[PDB]
Design a protein around this ligand. Structure first.
Ligand SMILES: *C(=N)CNC(=O)[C@@H]1Cc2ccc(OCCN)c(c2)-c2cc(ccc2OCCN)[C@H](N(C)C(=O)[C@H](CCN)NC(=O)c2cnc(-c3ccc(C(C)(C)C)cc3)nc2C)C(=O)N[C@@H](C)C(=O)N1
Length: 239
């Protein structure tokens, strides 16, 4: 088993608080080679993402670019997102579109304030981000809103998500899958529904649709370095 590992820079905030601007991750590629006993042939197996894995993939709207999101929907999944509660419902194997009762348990913790504040640049009567500031919970920041935090359990994978208390998704700017209602998608075979942990600051599958299996690059396994000063506390596993 010969696994290829590649380094990626995280320049965006779409995966906060799990991945921050300045994190340098390691990605394990899904395609790996296995040679014959001595020398005869070489088999190349392609691993599949598990629900909740942090996956790097070639952007469907521009395959020259790599994007990183969490694979929340797998083939056959009926993915439903409530833009108001900012919570997901996953019903696996419901590709036919029937009244199935084998729903995946997606549970959420109590909401609490995060270690991050988001500031907005006044563009002559508007609000567009300039960056995400790490501010002590008892302290505050000018023109900045303190983001919320809660844990999300995708069946057997628990991770953290960030939410902006004032912002809510514009469901009219969402990708609408033909035949399905708004904020409801059934993942077709060989496709993946990707979402960012910074739920209100992530251009993901809600907006540009499913990711084909051929577009997948690999799984994020570690943070091997992080700059802001060095964030030595962040080197290690990705939780
Ligand atoms: C959702 N919306 C979240 N967004 C993403 O997922 C982004 C989307 C995106 C869009 C555009 C864009 O750049 C446009 C500029 N033309 C980026 C991301 C982007 C992506 C990256 C870096 C910058 C960047 O934009 C900057 C402009 N603001 C990274 N990226 C390109 C890499 O990580 C590359 C990959 C090469 N295919 N890796 C490296 O450049 C790299 C090379 N070598 C090393 C390295 C490390 C150590 C060593 C030693 C052995 C120690 C010596 C040697 C060599 N390290 C690195 C990191 C990117 O593609 N990231 C994706 C996941 C991303 O963030 N997309």
């Amino acid at each position: 088993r010969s696994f290829i590992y590649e380094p990626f820079q995280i320049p965006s905030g779409s995966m906060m608080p799990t991945l921050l601007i300045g994190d340098f991750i390691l990605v394990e590629k899904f395609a790996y080679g296995i040679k014959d006993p001595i020398y005869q042939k070489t088999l190349i197996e392609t691993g599949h993402p598990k629900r909740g894995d942090i996956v790097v993939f070639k952007y469907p709207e521009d395959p020259k670019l790599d994007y990183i999101k969490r694979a929340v929907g797998l083939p056959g999944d009926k993915v439903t997102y409530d833009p108001v509660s900012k919570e997901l419902t996953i019903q696996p194997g419901c590709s036919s579109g029937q009244a199935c009762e084998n729903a995946l348990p997606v549970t959420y913790s109590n909401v609490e304030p995060s270690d991050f504040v988001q500031t907005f640049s006044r563009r002559n009567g508007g609000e567009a981000t300039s960056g995400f500031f790490e501010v002590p919970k008892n302290e505050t920041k000018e023109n900045g809103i303190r983001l919320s935090e809660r844990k999300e359990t995708l069946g057997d994978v628990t991770h953290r998500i960030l939410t902006v208390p004032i912002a809510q998704d514009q469901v009219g700017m969402y990708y609408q899958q033909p035949g399905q209602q708004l904020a409801t998608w059934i993942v077709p075979p060989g496709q993946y529904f990707m979402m960012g942990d910074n739920r209100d600051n992530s251009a993901d599958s809600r907006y540009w649709g499913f990711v084909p299996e051929a577009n997948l690059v690999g799984r994020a396994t570690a943070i091997w370095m992080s700059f802001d000063g060095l964030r030595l506390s962040r080197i290690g596993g990705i939780h």
